[PDB]
Design a protein around this nucleic acid. Structure first.
Ligand code: MG
Ligand code: MG
Ligand code: MG
Ligand code: MG
Ligand code: MG
Ligand code: MG
Ligand code: MG
Ligand code: MG
Ligand code: MG
Ligand code: MG
Ligand code: MG
Ligand code: MG
Ligand code: MG
Ligand code: MG
Lengths: 63, 96, 114, 119, 173, 179, 123
RNA sequence: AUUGUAUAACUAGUGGGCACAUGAUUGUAAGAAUGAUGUGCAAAAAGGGAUGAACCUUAUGAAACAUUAAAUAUUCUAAA
RNA sequence: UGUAUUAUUGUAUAAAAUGGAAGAAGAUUACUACUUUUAUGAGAUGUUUCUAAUAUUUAGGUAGCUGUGCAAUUUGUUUGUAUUGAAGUAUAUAUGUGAGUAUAUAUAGAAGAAACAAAUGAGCCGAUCUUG
């Protein structure tokens, strides 16, 4: 008899609350999606809130 | 109403001194079993002032120490350690 | 000095009566912890004695406090004949309350029965 | 498990206690795990530990004694106990073996003398 | 509470008596020793000469004036034994040595004063019976004590010569 | 232990009756049972001593054994002094030796401890090194030592040399008699 | 009285953190520097030598920066600068800078009297 | 038994070591020279071995109270 | 009662360079051998308060790597002080874990401070360091 523990993926956890860019508009978008992602059950919204706090390299360009 | 005593030394190791607890030899107490009754008794020590008036500091017995009736006691301001072999007294009032 | 314990109050104090020079008693209040008990006892009922807190003074630890002598209550003198008769019954009790209490040397304090 | 205790005998003293002393350990020193954090071992954290199968502390002690299929899950959700120094001290030495004159090794049923003073 | 105590030193072991006195001084009392020439030293007389002869060899080679001194009198020899127990360099030990006094035999002042003995140091109750021993003043004659004869005479003469209620109960009550 | 300073009537060593056998297997179910008596302090110390004895007379490893039951034996003591003779084997520096002694005590638990006191001087070895073969009560005309034969004769009287003080105090005045 | 004054006196120390060897010469100033030698007895922390600053000595955030009166001080430069601390009358106290002249210092005390602000720096 | 595991990018210091326990080679022998396994000092506090880099108990912020280990209980020195 | 061995144990064999080392005084019940109790005694281990990215889990550290902060000189913008007395210097008091800061009294006589950003000739006990 075992019990399986729930696995939270690391692509949904958030580490940095402050963005490294000196832009005041990007800071106002970033905390809005953090405020929603705490009380949301949908997974893809949590992926957006992490992706706003990354660098320039980690979000490359898309054709 | 007071029973005389002798301040022997602080609580010691061979090379380290704990300055907060002092050892007192009470008169005519020779055992552990007789020393267990003298707990919670107020101890008054008499020391001088700067203008040579009397000054008084009081303390409460904490517990026994050894096999021959030596008794630990905790004061308000600790003993000056130059008052070795002086005389303090024990009251008959219990303090809880 | 040996003092008759009459009754306990509510202020974490007690009522007590000490003898005086000639056949005179008083009242005072001290802490319960300032006392020491002996096995000797006379019979005094608690309903005869009445209690009033303002009449009776108190005594602190420190010596240099002047205490005021309050005028003697009328209820006391009726109680005074109920206690000064009790001292005449037991043989040599007036000589017992005049002699001061002393610690004896060469013997431990908590050995005797007192 | 007995062969593992044979190799690690230089730091380990072990035995086999009774039911009454086992009941005395859990009520005094008990810490449960739920979601990788230590908790108070109430009647409500037992629910979230076992997903509602066990509802009382007395259910746990019944499963360690009579070895059942819930043995591994109940023995693992307890963190190691934390005990005091023994009242009265050790008799001989701490380094030598039990049959040699010390304390280390296998006490068979006499482990109940050492744990109660440390308890 | 500090007492004054006169001690008769006779029939005592020399080293063991000096052990109990050094704790009795460090609590702040005053003590005096009489008849220190009659203490006992265990063992044969032949080893006890060999021990003292090794003590008379230590002297400073460069300047012998600034060297270890060897006292002869049984009073001043007994003081050197008690000094080994006490921390005589600091202020704590300098005070306790100001309350010590020893004497030769029995002087004139202490004929009427009482004496005490120590039961943990008497020879009959300390050791096994039936072994050899010697006195202290018997040993120091061979090292140059000038006068062991007059003290024996004067002390022994001292040690030879010493060898209406019912009305008041009713009236006062 | 009121007058004495150590318990001389109930020593630490006791008497245990032991029994054990092998664990059953397929080739050999229901094997042989053995029994003995070893003197020790608890049953755990007596388990270790007995299993080593079974290693030497038979090839039985102690890892395969199982302990059946061990109980303690006590004797209703009356209080008469009896004679005892102990035969034993002790281990020393050079090798093993075997000897024989005769004692006088109340019970055989007590007579064993008088051997440990004598062996502390004459032999100078730890108490776990002596292996006791048997203790028996000796009747008369088997006493081979004059020390037991001197004390067995009736109506003995001999005084005592007094050398002990009767006060636990620091100092007493001179001329008080410590009788 | 204020209950915060009795809580403030529980967290006090005597330790001063004076630099090593600052008494032996007049070259070395008594401000604190950390020794970085090889044989340094102060760096290893043996008993009998000086103590070093660590983060365990830090007071809590309720008691930190508190005056003995029970308030936290603030510096004003004008007579009209008292406007932001009118509502914080019980928590904060004000004091005057050391450059204000004696004539302008009179008009500050009359304005701190009406609003109820407690001024430490006087005379 | 372990809530993570796996993968990349960039960059510093070091390359004169010594000691204890177990077992070896050369040498009459060495606080001598040279290898093998484990742990230390270097870079590690307090208590004990009178004193000592490596021996014996022993994991780490500022303090107070009780229980022990190593070692000790005539006196210096706390404790029959 | 004595001759043979075995076990335990004592003495002789045993000699050096200034006055000596069981740590010392001294000990024959403070030496040696074997057991049980009592007590003293460590950032050890328990109980309570507080500080460090709801820590009932973690916290030493040479060479070395990274983060948060204090001191000095000059530049753009905003706010303010001063002949009823600015900058400097000398003594105290409070406050900060610490680099440090703020105020009070005496002396002296003409200019200096704070916030958001910028540029560096940007913080000494040592070099048989340089000048007085
Ligand atoms: Mg122990
Ligand atoms: Mg080891
Ligand atoms: Mg190096
Ligand atoms: Mg060390
Ligand atoms: Mg040594
Ligand atoms: Mg002592
Ligand atoms: Mg203790
Ligand atoms: Mg710890
Ligand atoms: Mg601790
Ligand atoms: Mg660190
Ligand atoms: Mg430069
Ligand atoms: Mg310079
Ligand atoms: Mg430098
Ligand atoms: Mg020059």
């Amino acid at each position: 008899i075992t019990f399986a523990k729930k696995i939270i993926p690391k692509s949904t956890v958030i580490k940095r609350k402050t963005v490294k860019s000196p832009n005041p508009l990007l800071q106002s978008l970033a905390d809005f999606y953090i405020k929603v992602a705490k009380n949301c059950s949908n997974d893809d919204i949590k992926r957006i809130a992490k992706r706003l706090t990354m660098s320039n390299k980690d979000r490359p360009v898309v054709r | 109403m007071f029973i005389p005593g002798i301040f022997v030394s602080h609580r010691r190791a061979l090379r380290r001194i704990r300055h907060t607890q002092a050892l007192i030899k009470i008169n005519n107490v020779v055992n552990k079993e007789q020393a267990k009754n003298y707990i919670g008794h107020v101890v008054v020590s008499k020391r001088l002032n700067d203008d040579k008036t009397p000054r008084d500091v009081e303390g409460v017995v904490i517990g026994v120490h050894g096999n021959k009736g030596l008794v630990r006691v905790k004061f308000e301001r600790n003993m000056p350690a130059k008052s070795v072999t002086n005389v303090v007294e024990v009251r008959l009032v219990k303090k809880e | 000095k040996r003092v008759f314990y009459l009754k306990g109050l509510d202020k974490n104090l007690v009522l007590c009566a000490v003898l005086k020079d000639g056949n005179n008693v008083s009242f005072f209040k001290i802490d319960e912890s300032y006392l020491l008990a002996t096995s000797t006892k006379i019979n005094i009922n608690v309903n005869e004695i009445h209690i009033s807190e303002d009449e009776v003074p108190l005594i602190t630890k420190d010596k240099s406090i002047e205490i005021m002598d309050i005028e003697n209550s009328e209820k006391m003198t009726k109680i005074e004949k109920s206690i000064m008769d009790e001292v005449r019954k037991v043989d040599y009790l007036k000589t017992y309350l005049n002699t001061p209490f002393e610690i004896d040397s060469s013997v431990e304090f908590y050995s005797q029965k007192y | 498990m007995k062969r593992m205790l044979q190799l690690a005998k230089d730091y380990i003293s072990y035995g086999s206690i009774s039911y009454e002393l086992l009941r005395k350990l859990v009520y005094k020193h008990g810490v449960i795990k739920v979601n990788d954090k230590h908790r108070k071992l109430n009647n409500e954290n037992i629910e979230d530990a076992f997903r509602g199968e066990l509802k009382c502390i007395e259910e746990i002690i019944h499963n360690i004694y009579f070895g059942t299929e819930y043995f591994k899950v109940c023995a693992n959700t307890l963190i190691p106990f934390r005990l005091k120094s023994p009242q009265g001290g050790f008799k001989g030495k701490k380094s030598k073996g039990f049959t040699e004159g010390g304390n280390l090794g296998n006490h068979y049923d006499l482990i109940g003398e050492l744990v109660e003073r440390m308890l | 509470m500090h007492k004054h105590i006169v001690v008769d030193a006779s029939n005592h072991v020399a080293g063991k008596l000096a052990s109990k006195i050094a704790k009795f001084l460090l609590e702040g009392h005053k003590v005096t020793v009489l008849c220190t020439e009659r203490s006992i030293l265990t063992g044969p007389l032949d080893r006890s000469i060999l021990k003292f002869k090794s003590f008379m060899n230590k002297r400073c080679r460069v300047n012998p004036r600034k060297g270890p001194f060897h006292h002869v009198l049984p009073s001043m020899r007994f003081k050197r034994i008690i000094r080994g127990m006490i921390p005589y360099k600091f202020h704590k030990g300098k005070e306790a040595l100001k309350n010590l006094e020893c004497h030769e035999g029995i002087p004139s002042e202490f004929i009427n004063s009482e004496r005490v003995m120590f039961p943990e140091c008497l020879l009959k109750y300390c050791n096994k019976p039936g072994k050899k021993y010697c006195l202290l003043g018997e040993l120091l004659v061979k090292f140059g004590w000038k006068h062991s004869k007059i003290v024996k005479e004067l002390t022994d003469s001292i040690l030879e010569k010493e060898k209406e209620l019912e009305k008041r109960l009713l009236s006062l009550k | 232990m009121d007058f004495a300073k150590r318990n001389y009537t109930v020593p630490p060593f006791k008497e245990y009756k032991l029994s054990a056998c092998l664990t059953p297997t397929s080739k050999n179910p229901q094997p042989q049972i053995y029994e003995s008596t070893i003197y020790a302090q608890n049953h755990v110390f007596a388990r270790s001593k007995f299993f080593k004895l079974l290693n030497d007379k038979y090839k039985l490893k102690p890892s395969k054994l199982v302990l059946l039951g061990a109980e303690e034996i006590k004797e209703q003591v009356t209080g008469e002094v009896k004679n005892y003779g102990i035969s034993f084997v002790f281990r020393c520096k050079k090798g093993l030796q075997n000897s024989y002694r005769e004692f006088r005590a109340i019970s055989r638990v007590s007579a064993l401890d008088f051997l440990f006191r004598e062996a502390a001087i004459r032999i100078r070895c730890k108490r776990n090194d002596i292996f006791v073969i048997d203790i028996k009560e000796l009747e008369d005309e088997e006493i081979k030592t004059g020390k037991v034969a001197e004390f067995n004769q009736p109506d003995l009287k001999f005084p005592v040399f007094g050398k002990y003080a009767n006060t636990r105090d620091l100092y007493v005045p001179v001329n008080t008699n410590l009788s | 009285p204020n209950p915060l004054i009795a809580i403030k006196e529980e967290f006090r120390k005597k330790i001063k953190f004076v630099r090593h060897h600052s008494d032996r010469y007049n070259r070395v100033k008594p401000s604190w520097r950390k020794p970085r030698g090889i044989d340094s007895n102060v760096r290893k922390g043996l008993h009998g030598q000086r103590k070093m600053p660590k983060i365990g000595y830090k007071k809590p955030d309720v008691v930190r920066y508190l005056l003995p009166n029970g308030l936290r001080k603030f510096i004003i430069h004008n007579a009209d600068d008292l406007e932001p601390l009118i509502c914080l009358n019980r928590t904060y106290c004000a004091e005057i800078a050391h450059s204000v002249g004696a004539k302008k210092r009179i008009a500050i005390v009359n304005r701190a009297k009406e609003l109820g602000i407690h001024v430490t720096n006087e005379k």
